[PDB]
RNA sequence: GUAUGUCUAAAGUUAUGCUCUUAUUUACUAACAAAAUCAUUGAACUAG
RNA sequence: AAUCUCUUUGCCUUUUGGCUUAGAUCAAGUGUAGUAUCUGUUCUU
């Protein structure tokens, strides 16, 4: 059953992430393209990333890293510092809008595609696809 | 005049997959933030008229954005 | 069956098409429009009935 | 079904992305109406009296 | 009288308007080539 | 709209600075200098 | 960077080059996504997509048109799909345009072409909202409820009765008036051409129709005449915005032959409502006087109200002054041509009305005009000025309105009582209306003030004194100069904006409280405080200062009429809007010549200067953020000559080369900003007047040579006015002995006044004033040019014909030369000795012809 | 000669250009459509069509209740004729002139209301000015191509004629004995293709189970056969 | 006037009614052209 | 039981391939030339 509507955003709500360790809050992309975190208990807008000229197609936290990763039809992929609430990597080379982020459960690794028809296997380290 | 079209489909990555490439150093490539961080474990009477006698999803409807079209246009 | 587009603004090819393919009542109104005949009636009679 | 919020249209009424929390108990999804819609299981509900949709495998579709 | 259909009829018409042969595996090729 | 026991919320402010840390750093010593 | 230059010898450049979301291609790629996805929904959807996309296009072609978008038997799941992805785009086009015009407004940097995307979009949001609007009073019915139009009715009528007021009758075929309003109302028309040498199609068109007119005076008063008579159905009205960067206005473009019509009756009907005496003396603008002279009239008004400044009872005065919000897109036509009949004949009436109702274009937008005003009428002036005496009325009240006008049969001059006991009978001491603009001036006596705010808060309870939070106040003056936030004339000042908000009904004017200022003079208050047309204005009694100090220009001495003594002091300052418009000004000028002549530039530079100071004149000395706009104006004029000659190196440009006249090869640019700039501890500053006790530098240049300001060759107001009551007091006295010698005043037996006075004595001798005699509402009708003309002149406050030249700036150029070290030290910067010509005074300019003139006529490309 | 101010009365002439005008640049682009007209202004050519010319008009005969509707809403509304006229779905001149007809110019003169008076017919006799119009109608009518499509029909053209210039020189030459290559294409960039020089990114059949060696043999030997012979030879119910 | 494109052609030999004459109308194109009122002055100058 | 041609139904088979500030503005011209074009007259037919 529906429990609470939260509204903020000024775009379709395009992605949403839960911390997976805390899971005290959570993140969506949107058209509008930001990214918002809200507080999971209540519902509050926490803070609010823009980091992206184009919609937010999907945000991925890492569980063994203090880091988000954004993806968006600006073509970009973003690795986010959560100690920092700003933008430490950029892995550059997506033809086209990335749809898809997924982070590697034991490898220090990200995979990444969207309408170039190819999945991106970049080294967090290095952003090295 | 055809020069003016649409996309019938995306280039694919897998094009540049064969391709040989160059060796060119770009700027944002260079070495930073090279280390990974880990987590944790009567004068009032003699007028003809006086006391004597929203949230909406819809921009262009919005109440804000009629007060910034009455605010910005005169 | 999706119809064929026909644009009235754009026409890429040239083409000529049929005329047919490029191409609020509220009682308020009538209540004021009938009270200010009233009006106008009371003030063109009450000015004769003043100045006789 | 979802409600869409005021003044929204009916295409509107989509659900794009969702994901459950960390204990699985409470469902986030993000719509086409600019919303954030929390879904959360009726604590009330048992199986008798919440049996949901009935078992009726319909056999007109071969997908079995 | 003009009319816009008789208008549209004549500009119909106004619009509307050599056979090489390959003598040769040479000709053919140019042509295949081409082609 | 949703009925009496739906919360619905209007979100426009950010409740936390912006510099406020999502994942706070952990600093298992420490130091007085 | 050597290395990769290398790199691309022996290996070649890159295939597999990936260009980024820039800028310029954001709009591109987003139209890519959008598509994608459309297809995708699509093509899931259904059990050729490119085909299918065009309904997207033609989708979103019709939301910018406002056309609604409706393709016959398309499936309904598809429909919804394109209309949802259409009002995403529509919202993410919208916040565009906001987050753009946001950055427009606060000088952020921002495109040209960006600027002119923005204005188009605003444009169409603009429209599509007033269509809405209109649609929306359609379903809903008027809002002005019928009881309430039937007392706006009466209302109007018991006025008019007691003015005994004779209704306009319809301009005779035989009028002994026609031909010199005729000529007057061409001459308006003509005007906007009076100097473009490029003309369009549509300017020719309406060029020749004047010409016609002058040339067959007869048949066009013939025309116009049946058409006031008898059309009742018109042309649509074209409108577009201008660009202010703070705001955009609306332009309407009516058909030149209406037109011809339209300003022939807004003269007849200003001519004759004159004559007719059917506007009140509180109404303005008014032919009578420029507004800084009604500024300073008002002020020495004030001024000499009977015991206005007195305190020892516990009296009190307010000046409510306030916005009569949307008035004039509020108004019913039906009510209107009520109105109307009341004051005209009813074939002009009927002939006001019709032409309001008309089909507003924009592009491809369109719609019926069915309620509101349309201000780029020619009549629209009078029509407005009408409603507002509805609404003055409504405010003042049939008793009190009597009053300040006066017996129809010997009305009051402005702000004038038949006696001292009418001036006191009553709360309201003074009225008046500057268009939409009310300023009323209230005294109270301590029980009359006791007993309103009592009222009120037993209304509108303040259990724990908050009143103060909102309550608007001049911000440019200091704490200790602007009205202070006592809970008693907090009170007071709301209670008397609740009172007089009460007295005009919402459907006629939305009266807001956000839009409002109400300044309090008490024991507690020695300040009294407001703004006017342009001016901000502290009034402080002489009786309420610590001590009387000595002033520079910029604050007014207020004479007590009675005592002939100065017993008031008006300081001046330039409104913040005011100095944001001047700003936005330069900023155009910046803006629209990117590839003008540096002459034209300076030109333009010069114009906008020139309209500032000889407007604002005094008020400007104490305005320092009116100073530090003027610096940086002043210095991106000339950045401007210099970055097209590609350089910005001071040395490169002394002051000769921009402040050097014309007929010596300068750009003979003004300076106002080589002056010092005052400066002083802002925390102070902002709490109390600090004086000037520090100065910092203005703009500045290596040469040791100090340039002449403007401001020190136009005579501040106050002496015009002073000089003004003196030479015509004397001109009065000339005037009764010349008729008693029986003599005609010679034009030399006024020499040495006739370049005094405001109007200027020489207006007397002007070459047509037997025509201008007829020429009334003319500083309304300049001033509503803004609405129906896209390049309107900066002196819109002030006519030649009916003032004079108010001001001569030929000796700013004789001291710049001066200035600049003479004619020597000017050429000795240029590269007249190269030419060997003889002398410095054969140094004519071919200022009239040139290759370049030979050549705008040809058929060009744009290149 | 300049015409400064257009308009005058409505020819069938213009109408019928106006509507096929209209049939290929939509109801937008009224500059356009009045660029084919001599006499008409953009503005003019859009009340023409707004007020008179679009099929969607209700021109009818008035029923009673749209009679009674009409001296209602011009009783409620008065003088405001286009608000009337948007209520009552038709033309704002012709209920004007309904009710001016239910209340019951000169030689020089200027019509206002042109753009909503019945078209003048063509006598017999175009006047030559109206025939060139006509023309040029047609004329501007009929393209549809650009710039660059228009120039790539005639470089196929010349393109055509240059090859058929090649082979004529290239027989004379054969006839005499002097045998001859055809001029190949100039290479444009390093990697530029000759197609018939191999099977360019040939991708052969996927192997199947059955053999096909006895059927390759044969194609290859009619493969050759041809080849040797070009060689040789050369080549009621409705109811409201 | 550009951008820019195309061309350059032997030898340096690879074995066997419907038209016509012609006088006009109309449109488009022309970096072609120093054009007589309004002690000698548009004058070598304009391009995406 | 097998041809040929009609008519309907099905198939649409040369059957509109993006974006922005409708992307913007313009449509008054002398001589001579070039190209197309118009009326008439004889001539062709």
């Known amino acids: ?129 | 005049t055809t020069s003016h079209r649409p996309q019938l489909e995306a280039r694919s990555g897998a094009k540049a997959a064969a391709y040989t490439p160059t060796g060119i150093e770009h700027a944002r490539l260079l070495p930073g933030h090279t280390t990974l961080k880990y987590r944790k474990f009567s004068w009032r009477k003699g007028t003809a008229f006086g006391r004597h006698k929203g949230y909406i999803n819809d921009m262009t409807k919005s109440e804000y954005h009629q007060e910034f079209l009455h605010k910005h246009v005169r | 069956k999706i119809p064929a587009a026909v644009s009235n603004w754009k026409n890429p090819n040239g083409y000529t098409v049929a005329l047919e393919r490029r191409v609020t009542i509220n009682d308020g109104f009538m209540k004021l429009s009938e009270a200010l005949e009233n009006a106008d009636k009371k003030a063109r009679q009450e000015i004769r009935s003043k100045m006789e | 079904a979802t409600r869409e919020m005021v003044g929204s249209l009916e295409g509107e009424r989509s659900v794009l992305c969702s994901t459950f929390d960390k204990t699985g108990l409470r469902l986030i999804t993000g719509e086409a109406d600019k919303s954030i819609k929390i879904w959360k299981q009726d604590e009330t509900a048992t199986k008798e009296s919440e049996p949901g949709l009935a078992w009726n495998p319909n056999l007109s579709a071969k997908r079995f | 009288h003009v009319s816009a259909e008789q208008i549209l009829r004549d500009v119909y018409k106004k619009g509307q308007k050599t056979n090489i042969d390959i003598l040769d595996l040479e000709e053919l090729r140019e042509y295949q080539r081409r082609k | 709209p949703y009925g009496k026991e739906v919360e619905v919320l209007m979100e426009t402010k950010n409740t936390q600075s912006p510099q406020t840390p999502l994942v706070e750093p952990v600093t298992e010593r420490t130091k007085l200098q | 960077y050597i290395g990769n230059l290398i790199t691309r010898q022996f290996e070649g450049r890159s295939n597999e080059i990936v260009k980024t979301t820039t800028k310029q291609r954001l709009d591109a790629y987003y139209d890519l996504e959008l598509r994608n996805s459309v297809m995708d929904d699509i093509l899931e959807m259904m059990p050729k997509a490119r085909t299918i996309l065009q309904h997207l296009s033609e989708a979103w072609r019709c939301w910018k048109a406002n056309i609604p978008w409706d393709v016959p038997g398309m499936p309904a799941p598809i429909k919804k799909i394109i209309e949802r992805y259409i009002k995403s785009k529509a919202d993410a086009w919208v916040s565009a345009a906001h987050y753009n015009r946001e950055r427009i407004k606060r000088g952020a940097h921002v495109e040209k072409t960006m600027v002119k995307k923005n204005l188009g979009r605003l444009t169409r949001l603009w429209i599509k909202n007033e269509q809405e609007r209109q649609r929306q009073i359609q379903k809903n019915g008027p809002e002005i409820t019928p009881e309430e139009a039937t007392t706006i009715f009466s209302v109007m009528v018991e006025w008019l009765e007691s003015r005994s007021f004779s209704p306009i009758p319809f301009p005779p075929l035989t009028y002994k008036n026609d031909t010199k309003i005729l000529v007057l109302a061409l001459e308006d028309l003509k005007d906007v051409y009076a100097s473009k040498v490029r003309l369009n199609a549509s300017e020719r068109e309406e060029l020749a129709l004047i010409e016609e007119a002058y040339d067959n005076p007869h048949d066009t008063l013939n025309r116009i005449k049946k058409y006031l008579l008898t059309q009742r159905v018109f042309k649509p009205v074209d409108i577009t915005m201008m660009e202010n960067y703070q705001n955009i206005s609306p332009v309407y473009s009516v058909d030149p032959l209406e037109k011809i019509t339209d300003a022939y009756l807004d003269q007849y009907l200003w001519y004759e409502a004159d004559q007719r005496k059917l506007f009140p003396n509180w109404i303005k603008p008014s032919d009578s006087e420029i507004p800084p002279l009604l500024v300073y009239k008002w002020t020495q008004g004030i001024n000499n109200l009977s015991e206005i400044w007195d305190v020892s009872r516990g009296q009190s005065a307010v000046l409510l002054e306030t916005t009569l919000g949307e008035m004039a897109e509020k108004i019913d036509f039906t009510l209107l041509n009520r109105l109307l009949r009341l004051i005209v004949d009813p074939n002009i009436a009927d002939y006001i009305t019709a032409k309001n109702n008309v089909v507003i274009n924009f592009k491809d937008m369109s719609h019926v005009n069915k309620y509101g005003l349309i201000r780029g009428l020619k009549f629209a002036s009078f029509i407005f000025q009408y409603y507002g005496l509805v609404i003055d009325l409504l405010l003042l009240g049939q008793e009190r309105a009597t009053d300040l006008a006066g017996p129809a049969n010997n009305p009051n001059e402005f702000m004038q009582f038949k006696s001292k006991e009418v001036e006191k009978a009553h709360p309201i001491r003074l009225y008046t209306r500057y268009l939409d603009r009310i300023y009323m001036l209230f005294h109270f006596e301590e029980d009359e003030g006791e007993e309103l705010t009592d009222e009120y808060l037993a209304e509108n309870p303040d259990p724990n004194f908050e009143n103060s939070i909102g309550y608007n106040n001049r911000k440019c003056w200091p704490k200790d100069s602007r009205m202070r936030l006592i809970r008693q004339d907090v009170n007071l000042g709301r209670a008397v904006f609740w009172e007089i908000q009460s007295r005009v009904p919402t459907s006629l004017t939305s009266i807001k409280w956000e839009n409002a200022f109400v300044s309090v003079y008490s024991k507690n208050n020695p300040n009294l405080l407001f703004s006017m047309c342009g001016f901000e204005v502290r009034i402080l009694p002489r009786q309420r200062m610590e001590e009387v100090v000595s002033n520079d220009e910029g604050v007014w001495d207020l004479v007590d009429e009675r005592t002939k003594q100065r017993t008031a002091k008006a300081y001046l300052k330039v409104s913040e809007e005011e100095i944001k418009k001047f700003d936005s000004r330069i900023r155009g000028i910046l803006m629209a010549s990117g590839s003008t002549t540096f002459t034209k530039v300076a030109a333009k530079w010069n114009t906008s200067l020139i309209s500032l100071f000889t407007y604002f004149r005094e008020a400007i000395v104490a305005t320092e953020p009116l100073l530090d706009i003027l610096v940086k104006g002043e210095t991106r004029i000339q950045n401007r000559v210099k970055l097209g000659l590609n350089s910005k190196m001071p040395t490169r440009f002394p002051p000769a080369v921009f402040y050097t006249p014309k007929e010596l090869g300068g750009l003979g640019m003004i300076s106002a900003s080589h002056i010092l700039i005052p400066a002083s501890d802002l925390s102070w500053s902002k709490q109390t007047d600090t004086g000037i006790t520090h100065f910092r530098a203005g703009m500045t240049h290596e040469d040791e040579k100090l340039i002449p300001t403007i401001f020190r060759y136009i005579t501040t107001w106050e002496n015009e006015f002073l000089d003004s009551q003196r030479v015509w007091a004397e001109y009065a006295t000339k005037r009764q002995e010349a008729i008693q010698q029986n003599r005609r005043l010679a034009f030399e037996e006024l020499e040495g006044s006739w370049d005094r006075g405001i109007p200027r004595i020489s207006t007397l001798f002007q070459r047509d004033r037997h025509t201008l005699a007829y020429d009334r509402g003319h500083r309304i009708r300049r001033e509503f040019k803004q609405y129906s003309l896209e390049r309107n002149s900066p002196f819109w406050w002030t006519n030649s014909h009916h003032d004079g030249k108010l001001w001569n700036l030929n000796a700013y150029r004789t001291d710049v030369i001066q200035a600049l070290g003479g004619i020597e030290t000017i050429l000795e910067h240029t590269l007249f000795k190269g030419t060997g010509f003889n002398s410095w005074e054969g140094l004519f300019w071919e200022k009239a012809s040139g290759f370049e003139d030979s050549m705008q006529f040809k058929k060009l490309t744009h290149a | 000669v300049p015409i400064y101010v257009k308009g005058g009365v409505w020819t069938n002439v213009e109408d019928q250009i106006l509507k096929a005008a209209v049939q290929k640049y939509g109801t937008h682009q009224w500059s356009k459509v009045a660029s084919l007209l001599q006499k008409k202004t953009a503005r003019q050519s859009e009340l023409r069509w707004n007020e008179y010319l679009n099929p969607k008009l209700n021109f009818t005969e008035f029923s009673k209740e749209e009679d009674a509707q009409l001296l209602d809403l011009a009783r409620e509304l008065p003088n405001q004729w286009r608000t009337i006229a948007d209520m009552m779905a038709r033309p704002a001149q012709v209920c004007v002139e309904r009710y001016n007809r239910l209340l019951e110019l000169k030689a020089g003169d200027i019509n206002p209301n042109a753009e909503t008076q019945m078209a003048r017919p063509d006598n017999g006799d175009l006047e030559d000015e109206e025939k060139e119009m006509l023309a040029e109608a047609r004329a501007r009518l009929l393209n549809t191509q650009g710039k660059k499509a228009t120039r790539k029909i005639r470089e196929r053209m010349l393109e055509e004629s240059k090859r058929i210039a090649e082979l004529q020189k290239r027989r004379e030459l054969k006839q005499a004995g002097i045998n001859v290559a055809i001029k190949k294409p100039k290479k444009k960039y390093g990697t530029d293709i000759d197609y018939n020089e191999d099977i360019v990114y040939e991708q052969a059949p996927m192997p199947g189970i059955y053999d096909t060696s006895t059927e390759d043999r044969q194609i290859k030997k009619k493969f050759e056969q041809f080849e040797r012979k070009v060689n040789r030879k050369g080549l009621e119910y409705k109811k409201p």
């Open chain 1, 1 to 129: 059953k529906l429990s609470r509507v939260i509204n903020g955003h000024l775009g379709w709500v395009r992605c949403v992430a839960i911390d997976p360790v805390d899971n005290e809050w959570f993140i969506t992309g949107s058209n509008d393209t930001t990214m918002k975190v809200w507080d999971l208990a209540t519902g509050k807008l926490k803070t609010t990333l823009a980091g992206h000229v184009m919609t937010v197609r999907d945000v991925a936290v890492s569980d063994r890293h203090p880091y988000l990763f954004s993806v968006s039809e600006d073509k970009t992929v973003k690795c986010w510092d959560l100690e920092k609430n700003q933008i430490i990597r950029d892995y550059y080379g997506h033809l086209s809008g990335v749809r898809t982020v997924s982070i590697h459960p034991t490898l220090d690794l990200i995979a990444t595609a969207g309408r170039d028809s190819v999945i991106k296997l970049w080294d967090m380290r290095t952003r090295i696809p």
